[PDB]
């Protein structure tokens, strides 16, 4: 089983400065690149960082970089990221994920208080019933081919990799769940809706860098 | 800018022998593999043989194991295919084609006239449509593929192209237009607006083990 | 744990027959490399036979060879396979199956074939060596045309499988001491063991891996 | 023909910018890795700063980190180097290099005036037509065989000479030869031919930073 294990969080003041940590295993770490990706409070999800699998070259956000540095100790299958210069703004709960773009596992989460480019759409906000079919739309500023990722997040739990590519299906995740779509235009259909499938879904880009994600569409009753 | 130029056709007797060869060029020839697949006349594409980066490893169908011998020479950046003991089920045409299960980009293709396991069901056989209306192809496997699926299209005389690869990723240059969908026995291709250069016969390839075999073939044509 | 390569299906048939040699692989991930099963003649060098690559599509064959011998591998049951059809008093010897398709790192214990009625030149100069312990010995290695880089040199004691020394020419290969040294490039290599010591009395080969086939050396025999 | 173009040095003063482009030609520029590697006036070469095959992954020194950016544009084939709040010790004649570890191919280099460690032995040697030289360098830590073999004539920019230690180049006479492993290497010149009369460095590439030798001048 893939395991990747968080911890390292908590609370500064502004300016401080802050070591998440991150322990895999269940796969061969060297041979897959990393990631951090952050979720403030009730806002959607952001990519932070990026790390390769020899762990030379490395990708931040503008709103981190300068101030945030993602490491990786392979000797000991570990991630880091030093979080430098904190600011309000940064207080979210964060993940480390495998690979570059493309999620399949994702970490706990571990919370961050601080206290004293192409544009991805979705519909934000719909109400729905049990046994309903219900079709999200994600769009993107600019052609992506099948270059779309669907994750699901429950409140305060870890998002999960349910759809890769514009319509292939994640190992476990039952086939009521259909992507279609290509270049600017992608679906995500629930079809009939059905017992926990009431969370927030995002889309997310994995073409260029930083990789992107929707605003997120809660579906609720 | 990328070419494969085929000679070595012609008409020869049966248990008579021939040799193809493909001359590439716009890629690194000896940085991919390359395979020969061939077309009964009126048939549909049948793999016929692939050739690993170096030239070393081979692989053949059962039809022509033991009697067709693939080559290559990467110093000159050629492709060979030699035929011996030529059958009259041989008479095709022959085309070259880059990488081994995954044919980007093909050749013209060469007669051969000889005179003197994984099935995919493609279905239907045969549809007539007009312009601007929707069609779905279906193609079926014996056993679960994954995504290792292939959508080609083929006008009349022309060598194949690569439209869908991994079922759903779409090729450059293929208009949106064209959706792939399906996994593991179940797949579609989906043409939305049917265009007036849309009228064609296109195939589904498997792509995960060997032999890479076709589907039937279906023909969308206007009436 | 470690790499092991276990053999099995050999014996004796008669000409014209067909026997099956099996290879069970584990300790490492089998369908990420290739495979190859190399023979040994009764009193000649090694001879590589056939070769698998990581998916088992395409596969290679060598002319003495070609057209009665099949490869094949099972990457669900991490197995290598051989099919010798139309067996000739030639084939008579000890097979090997070895991981990797030019650079053999890993060997299998090999199988004995008896069948009994009831291309790059590469020349090694040494065929026979008697010297006494703690003795400096240069084994000499000489190919037809240039090969750059692509040399291997392995050990072998007489009814066991070889054993990977050298690989790319002059880098050592982990376990090997540091008493064995490559040199060499293009048409001309040497593998000196500096101090000779006991265990190193045995049967050296060199092996090109530019090419296909995959030629051996003659072999030199240490020997006191 | 491999062309790496370089342009847009001069001279700057301290606490100034400057913007470095490389037009790259002749090759996939989207499918390969590409890095900056200066040399200080009469010092030795020190790698810079790698970006990844796309515009995303960067890497650099610690002495360049928060002042200088690298990035590229494939649709240009161009490579960028912005090197801002520069300092007095940035003063160098700057390279691009194809891949990030072992650069086959180098550029003109271009003059930016602001006005594991590797060791080499010996500094500078001198010999005559068609001696022997032996040049060894060593390693704080073992490197497997994760070593290259560069050398550079005077006011041209170097040429890679060994790959892995041991692996010759193509085009490089056979007389160089590459030895070594871990902690201890060797390169070994045999007959000394006029052209080989240059600087001779050592890299390692198998770890960040990627960390160049002093440096052997053969002279004379």
């Known amino acids: 089983k893939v395991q990747l294990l968080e911890s390292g969080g908590g609370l500064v003041q502004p300016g401080g400065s802050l070591r998440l940590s991150c322990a895999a295993s269940?796969?061969?770490?060297?041979?897959?690149?990393m990631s951090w990706v952050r979720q403030a409070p009730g806002k959607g999800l952001e990519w932070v960082s990026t790390?390769?699998?020899?762990?030379?070259?490395?990708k931040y956000a503008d709103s981190v970089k300068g101030r945030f540095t993602i490491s990786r100790d392979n000797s000991k299958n570990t991630l880091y990221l030093q979080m430098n210069s904190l600011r309000a703004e940064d207080t979210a709960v964060y993940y480390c994920?495998?690979?570059?773009?493309?999620?399949?596992?994702w970490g706990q989460g571990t919370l961050v208080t601080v206290s004293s480019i192409q544009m991805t759409q979705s519909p934000s906000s719909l109400s729905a019933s049990v046994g309903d079919r219900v079709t999200i739309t994600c769009r993107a500023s600019?052609?992506?081919?099948?270059?779309l990722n669907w994750y699901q997040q429950k409140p305060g739990k870890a998002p999960k990799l349910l759809i890769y590519?514009?319509?292939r299906l994640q190992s476990g995740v039952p086939s009521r769940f259909s992507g279609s779509g290509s270049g600017t235009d992608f679906t995500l259909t629930i079809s009939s809706l059905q017992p926990e499938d009431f969370a927030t879904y995002y889309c997310?880009?994995?073409?260029?860098?930083?990789?992107?994600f929707g605003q997120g569409t809660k579906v609720e009753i | 800018k990328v070419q494969l130029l085929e000679s070595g056709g012609g008409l020869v007797q049966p248990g008579g022998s021939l040799r193809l060869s493909c001359?590439?060029?716009?890629?690194?020839?000896?940085?991919?593999?390359?395979?020969?697949v061939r077309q009964a006349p009126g048939k549909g594409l049948e793999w016929?043989?692939?050739?690993?980066?170096?030239?070393?490893?081979?692989?053949?169908?059962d039809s022509v194991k033991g009697r067709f011998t693939i080559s290559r020479d990467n110093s000159k950046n050629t492709l060979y295919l030699q035929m011996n003991s030529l059958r009259a089920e041989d008479t095709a045409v022959?085309?070259?084609?880059?990488?081994?299960?995954?044919?980007?980009?093909?050749?013209?293709g060469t007669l051969v006239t000889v005179s003197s396991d994984i099935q995919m069901t493609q279905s239907p056989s045969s549809l007539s449509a007009s312009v601007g209306d929707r069609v779905t192809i279906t193609c079926?496997?014996?056993?679960?593929?994954?995504?290792?699926?292939?959508?080609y299209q083929q006008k009349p005389g022309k060598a194949p192209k690569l439209?869908?690869?991994?079922?759903?990723?779409?090729?450059s240059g293929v208009p949106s237009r064209f959706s792939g969908s399906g996994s593991g026995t179940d797949f579609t291709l989906t043409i939305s607006s049917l265009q007036p250069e849309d009228f064609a016969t296109?195939?589904?390839?498997?792509?995960?083990?060997?032999?890479?075999?076709?589907?039937?073939g279906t023909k969308v044509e206007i009436k | 744990a470690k790499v092991q390569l276990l053999e099995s299906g050999g014996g004796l048939v008669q000409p014209g027959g067909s026997l099956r040699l099996s290879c069970?692989?584990?300790?490492?991930?089998?369908?990420?490399?290739?495979?190859?099963?190399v023979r040994q003649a009764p009193g000649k060098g090694l001879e590589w036979?056939?070769?698998?690559?990581?998916?088992?599509?395409?596969?290679?064959?060598?002319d003495s060879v070609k057209g009665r011998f099949t490869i094949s591998r099972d990457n669900s049951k991490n197995t290598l396979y051989l099919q010798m059809n139309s067996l000739r008093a030639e084939d008579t010897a000890v097979?090997?199956?070895?991981?990797?398709?030019?650079?053999?790192?890993?060997?299998?214990?090999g199988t004995l074939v008896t069948v009994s009625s009831g291309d790059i030149q590469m020349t090694q100069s040494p065929s026979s060596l008697s010297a006494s312990v703690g003795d400096r010995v240069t084994i000499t290695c000489?190919?037809?045309?240039?090969?750059?880089?692509?040399?291997?040199?392995y050990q072998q004691k007489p009814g066991k499988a070889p054993k990977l020394?050298?690989?790319?020419?002059?880098?050592?290969?982990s376990g090997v001491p540091s008493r064995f040294s490559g040199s060499g490039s293009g048409t001309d290599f040497t593998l000196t063991i500096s101090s000779l010591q006991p265990e190193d009395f045995a049967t050296?080969?060199?092996?090109?891996?530019?090419?296909?086939?995959?030629?051996?050396?003659?072999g030199t025999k240490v020997e006191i | 023909k491999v062309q790496l173009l370089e342009s847009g040095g001069g001279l700057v003063q301290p606490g100034g910018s400057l913007r470095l482009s490389c037009?790259?030609?002749?090759?996939?520029?989207?499918?390969?890795?590409?890095?900056?590697v200066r040399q200080a006036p009469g010092k030795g070469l020190e790698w810079?700063?790698?970006?990844?095959?796309?515009?995303?992954?960067?890497?650099?020194?610690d002495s360049v980190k928060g002042r200088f950016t690298i990035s590229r544009d494939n649709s240009k084939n161009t490579l960028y180097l912005q090197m801002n709040s520069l300092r007095a010790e940035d003063t160098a004649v700057?390279?691009?290099?194809?891949?990030?570890?072992?650069?086959?191919?180098?550029?003109?280099g271009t003059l930016v005036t602001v006005s594991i460690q590797m060791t080499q032995s010996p500094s500078s040697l001198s010999a005559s037509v068609g001696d022997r030289v032996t040049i060894t360098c060593?390693?704080?830590?073992?490197?497997?065989?994760?070593?290259?073999?560069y050398q550079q004539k005077p006011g041209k920019a170097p040429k890679l000479?060994?790959?892995?230690?041991?692996?010759?180049?193509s085009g490089v006479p056979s007389r160089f030869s590459g030895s070594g492993s871990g902690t201890d290497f060797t390169l070994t010149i045999s007959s000394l031919q006029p052209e080989d009369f240059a600087t001779?460095?050592?890299?390692?590439?198998?770890?960040?930073?990627?960390?160049?030798?002093?440096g052997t001048k053969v002279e004379i």
């Open positions: 590519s514009a319509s």
């Open positions: 600019q052609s992506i081919s099948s270059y």
């Open positions: 269940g796969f061969t770490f060297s041979s897959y690149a």
């Open positions: 994920a495998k690979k570059r773009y493309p999620f399949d596992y």
């Open positions: 997310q880009q994995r073409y260029k860098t930083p990789g992107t």
């Open positions: 790390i390769s699998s020899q762990g030379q070259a490395t």
